[PDB]
DNA sequence: GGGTATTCGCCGCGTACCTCTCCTAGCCCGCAAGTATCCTATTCCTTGCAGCGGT
């Protein structure tokens, strides 16, 4: 049930794609909110994060 | 042509009864059963450099 205004967490199943994340990542930053990032790899965690940045 | 000889291939080789063993190889496909990397707890310690009493 609510929690009044939740809104329905809209899904989207892409094959990856720089510009999909420069996008969403865009969307978000100008919206104001923040954006989680998941890799799952302590290992290339850093490279990854580096490659995003 | 043809009468003859020579070869080649097919067909055939008893009855009755008793004991025993053994009747495809291999592939495939799905079950299922047993393994290498990722986070939050744990027990395992061994160094590096500045304070610091003390004289």
Redesign the pocket.
């Known amino acids: 049930t609510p929690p009044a205004r939740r809104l329905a967490v809209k899904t989207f199943v892409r094959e990856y794609d720089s510009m999909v994340v420069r996008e969403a990542i865009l969307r978000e930053i100008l919206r104001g909110g923040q954006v989680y990032y998941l890799?799952?790899?302590?290992?290339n965690?850093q490279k990854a994060a580096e490659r995003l940045a």
Request: glycine share 0%; charged share 35%.
């Open positions: 890799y799952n790899d302590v290992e965690i």
